[PDB]
């Protein structure tokens, strides 16, 4: 009791005398096929795994704790104007460059100083590139 | 025929 | 079942329905109102019962009416038409009963019936009880047919029929209450032992059997549903389809390995694709950090640009550093997904050589059931008699089956050592020419009104003919003989001084090294009070072991028993006996089977009598003169004894209706 027979699979074994011994051989030689590009990629991957020895550990940098500020000291006015020249509109990334302003006075910083720091002039300078 | 089996009576096909 | 209910079921008859055979004799009733039918059906079942609770005494019609109650005894022409139909077809008053009205002083008609095999005597008892003169022509010096009981000293052992296949509606049930038959129950536990001599692991034994039945069922659904029934122009054998099922299953273990190993290369090449983005960030990180160190080399105070080049290199390297932990996070879920896919691999094989060799033994059991290689069974029809299985455990006769034909032969005119030769049937009657087997020199002529041929299907098949039909049998018959299957199985009987097997198992297997030898000595039986073992030789082995001397067989036999029970515990057998049924003169094989390209509808061609042509041109189409019985004639019960006995009852009813009239039909 309990058997899975589709007409499809029947005729490819009944067609001729050796069509059974045929159909099983390419399965086996396609499993011999598939068993060895596993060897290949399992050992391509083994080599990619060792080149990543040590992780990125000698290269991580400590975290900088600074409580975010409100007023803009003349420095990170400029830190900003060069973040915007290099980082465009990523108000996240600008905020960790400056490190003392959260993402919102970053957002703020554009509009309140748009005239003075030529931030539109900085921004299409960003787009060429 | 099948009715002759007394041991390990086959069953695949009896309905 | 219970009451006038079980009567009908024990007579193989639907209790609530009138059968094709009763529609024939009571076409008034079956055509009539549904009420009258139930009064018939009750009379039929009531009579059948009365016969069945006491089957050692005849059931006179007068006896039937008296015991029957109102309103059903109000009509007595109906009670007579019923009782007379039953008695004529062997549903009542068949077998070895005591007569109440003894036989007519003068007889009527003559039948010569060829063969005192069980179907043979079945009719002769009935033909004779209808006041005909029956004479019985048998080529052997014994009455058994293919029921052969070896008896030397205390040992008893059947080389022919052995097993009552259950008393649930078995006519043989009636004979057992009639004859002194010691009926031993057969306990169905069968421990397989592989070639080594040690038992199959109870877990393997269930895994193979369960598989074997699922492969069987597959061919069934392959046959009756997907309609795979001709291939390259020939009919499919069960053997073929059994194999085609396995290659669709040895294919599937491999379609499932390919699918699984292809899901590993699915993700091994996502890891490759990932470890490339990760080596290419380790390196974009190497250079940033290098650049950020050289940006901290400029000592404060520094102008704001070179301060941004420290903070930007810091923002850039904390961002490219963030990406790499995401990519070693994603590498984490893959490294264990990949160790689990590889950890639950699919079935490594479909069946091992240890597995298939046990699958073999279930095919030998199929080849025993059918007395032939599965390569010859019809896929569609081999099991076509399935619907009529008897309910109940199988049994054996501890004093031997022969004890039954021998009983069925008392009171009968039987000519032994009389090989029929020619059957001559003509519009005016029949002559049958018979020689004496001992001298082949005494010739006998037997003239008779009709001939009942219980000639085994292998005899009938024999080329060149052991029996000549004059005139030749019509093409529709002889083609039914060619198409049919008469098959082979044999029995080796092993006879010891002491019981060394397990006394409380009746039967156990032996598993075959090859597919080819799967038939060879594949099953053993302990059945009789005496130390007796008994080995089946079916399959292709059946016909092969006939060309090999007794000792080589009893050798291979004791070889098996040794491995299984230990050289030391296996004495020598005191008496040994191999059967050779394919070589037996008056058998030519063991019993019939539904050969490929055959149907069960050939079993019914086999039973249509032969009517000889008109003697004078333009004389009225005669009476039929040549009738056929035997196990190879009864579609719904082939290749058993009960089926043979049943066929003899059939013809004896048919022969009487033709030559004594049927008074129960108006
Ligand atoms: C090995 C074996 C085991 C079996 N086991 C079982 C079993 O366990 N259970 C079961 O139910 N059935 C079993 N059977 C089947 C059963 O034995 C038969 O189906 C039945 O007994 C045969 O009845 P029959 O009357 O049709 O033929 P037979 O009994 O063969 O009757 C034919 C008769 O005709 C005679 N004869 C042949 N040629 C001539 C001739 N030219 N002139 C005169 N007489 C002739 C023969 O000698 C014989 O007496 C077995 C059969 C075999 C071979």
Short mmCIF file of C-alpha atoms in Angstrom, two decimals, chain A residues 1-7 9-10 12-16 20 23-24 26-28 30-31 34-35 37-38 41-45 48-56 58-62 64 66 75 78-79 82-83 86-87 90 92-94 96-99, chain C residues 210 213-215 217-219 221-222 226 228 231-232 244-245 247-252 254-255 257-258 261-262 264-265 267-269 271-272 275-276 278-279 281-282 285-286 289 292 304-305 307-308 311-318 321 324-325 331 335 338:
data_model
loop_
_atom_site.label_atom_id
_atom_site.label_comp_id
_atom_site.label_asym_id
_atom_site.label_seq_id
_atom_site.Cartn_x
_atom_site.Cartn_y
_atom_site.Cartn_z
CA UNK A 1 0.00 0.00 0.00
CA UNK A 2 1.08 3.56 -0.92
CA UNK A 3 2.91 4.05 -4.23
CA UNK A 4 3.80 6.99 -6.48
CA UNK A 5 3.53 6.13 -10.19
CA UNK A 6 3.18 8.79 -12.85
CA UNK A 7 2.79 7.76 -16.47
CA UNK A 9 8.35 8.14 -15.55
CA UNK A 10 7.07 4.77 -16.84
CA UNK A 12 11.34 6.22 -20.09
CA UNK A 13 12.09 2.82 -18.52
CA UNK A 14 9.84 0.69 -20.80
CA UNK A 15 10.83 2.27 -24.14
CA UNK A 16 13.53 -0.31 -24.92
CA UNK A 20 16.25 1.11 -17.49
CA UNK A 23 18.36 5.95 -17.25
CA UNK A 24 20.07 4.91 -14.01
CA UNK A 26 23.29 9.11 -16.14
CA UNK A 27 21.70 9.62 -12.76
CA UNK A 28 24.77 7.97 -11.20
CA UNK A 30 25.25 13.08 -12.72
CA UNK A 31 25.65 12.29 -9.02
CA UNK A 34 27.42 16.75 -8.50
CA UNK A 35 29.54 15.07 -5.84
CA UNK A 37 31.85 20.32 -7.71
CA UNK A 38 30.96 20.06 -4.04
CA UNK A 41 33.58 24.61 -4.07
CA UNK A 42 33.95 23.12 -0.56
CA UNK A 43 37.68 23.61 -1.04
CA UNK A 44 37.57 26.86 -2.98
CA UNK A 45 35.57 28.01 0.06
CA UNK A 48 38.58 31.75 1.11
CA UNK A 49 37.92 30.90 4.76
CA UNK A 50 41.61 30.90 5.79
CA UNK A 51 42.48 34.15 3.97
CA UNK A 52 39.98 35.67 6.43
CA UNK A 53 41.97 34.49 9.46
CA UNK A 54 42.15 36.94 12.33
CA UNK A 55 38.81 38.41 11.27
CA UNK A 56 38.94 42.18 11.12
CA UNK A 58 43.42 44.27 14.46
CA UNK A 59 41.38 46.82 12.48
CA UNK A 60 38.33 47.75 14.59
CA UNK A 61 38.35 51.13 16.27
CA UNK A 62 36.97 51.91 19.75
CA UNK A 64 33.52 57.32 20.84
CA UNK A 66 30.04 62.00 23.26
CA UNK A 75 35.00 73.70 13.81
CA UNK A 78 33.44 73.20 8.77
CA UNK A 79 33.52 69.46 9.54
CA UNK A 82 33.27 69.01 4.23
CA UNK A 83 31.08 66.08 5.22
CA UNK A 86 32.08 64.29 0.69
CA UNK A 87 28.98 62.58 2.12
CA UNK A 90 23.61 60.89 4.34
CA UNK A 92 23.56 59.67 9.42
CA UNK A 93 27.17 59.60 8.21
CA UNK A 94 27.51 63.38 8.63
CA UNK A 96 29.16 60.45 13.09
CA UNK A 97 31.79 62.53 11.31
CA UNK A 98 30.78 65.47 13.48
CA UNK A 99 30.03 63.08 16.35
CA UNK C 210 6.04 -4.00 3.60
CA UNK C 213 3.42 -5.44 -0.96
CA UNK C 214 3.84 -1.80 -1.94
CA UNK C 215 5.54 -2.97 -5.13
CA UNK C 217 0.00 -2.81 -5.22
CA UNK C 218 2.03 -0.65 -7.59
CA UNK C 219 1.62 -3.13 -10.46
CA UNK C 221 -2.45 0.43 -9.93
CA UNK C 222 -0.02 0.17 -12.84
CA UNK C 226 -2.50 3.56 -15.64
CA UNK C 228 0.13 -0.47 -18.78
CA UNK C 231 4.59 -3.30 -24.25
CA UNK C 232 6.31 -3.63 -27.67
CA UNK C 244 9.37 -1.85 -14.07
CA UNK C 245 8.13 -0.82 -10.64
CA UNK C 247 13.39 0.68 -11.78
CA UNK C 248 10.92 3.47 -11.11
CA UNK C 249 11.96 3.06 -7.48
CA UNK C 250 15.69 2.58 -7.96
CA UNK C 251 15.30 5.68 -10.09
CA UNK C 252 13.61 7.59 -7.28
CA UNK C 254 18.60 8.69 -7.24
CA UNK C 255 16.22 11.54 -8.20
CA UNK C 257 19.93 12.24 -3.99
CA UNK C 258 20.44 14.48 -7.02
CA UNK C 261 23.17 17.21 -3.34
CA UNK C 262 22.06 19.97 -5.74
CA UNK C 264 24.14 21.80 -1.20
CA UNK C 265 25.82 23.27 -4.27
CA UNK C 267 24.43 27.28 -0.90
CA UNK C 268 28.06 26.21 -1.11
CA UNK C 269 27.98 28.63 -4.06
CA UNK C 271 29.01 30.91 0.65
CA UNK C 272 31.58 31.19 -2.15
CA UNK C 275 33.34 34.82 1.20
CA UNK C 276 34.31 36.82 -1.89
CA UNK C 278 34.12 39.27 2.74
CA UNK C 279 37.70 38.91 1.47
CA UNK C 281 36.08 44.00 2.61
CA UNK C 282 38.86 42.61 4.79
CA UNK C 285 39.42 47.57 5.54
CA UNK C 286 43.17 46.88 5.54
CA UNK C 289 42.92 51.51 8.59
CA UNK C 292 43.56 56.22 9.11
CA UNK C 304 40.22 71.39 9.95
CA UNK C 305 40.57 69.49 6.67
CA UNK C 307 40.84 66.80 11.06
CA UNK C 308 38.04 65.67 8.77
CA UNK C 311 37.07 61.65 11.26
CA UNK C 312 36.03 60.76 7.69
CA UNK C 313 38.51 57.89 7.55
CA UNK C 314 36.99 56.99 10.92
CA UNK C 315 33.39 57.18 9.71
CA UNK C 316 34.38 55.37 6.51
CA UNK C 317 36.14 52.58 8.41
CA UNK C 318 33.43 52.18 11.02
CA UNK C 321 33.59 47.60 9.34
CA UNK C 324 31.66 42.95 7.38
CA UNK C 325 29.95 41.83 10.60
CA UNK C 331 27.86 33.36 6.89
CA UNK C 335 27.46 27.37 8.00
CA UNK C 338 24.97 23.53 5.29
#
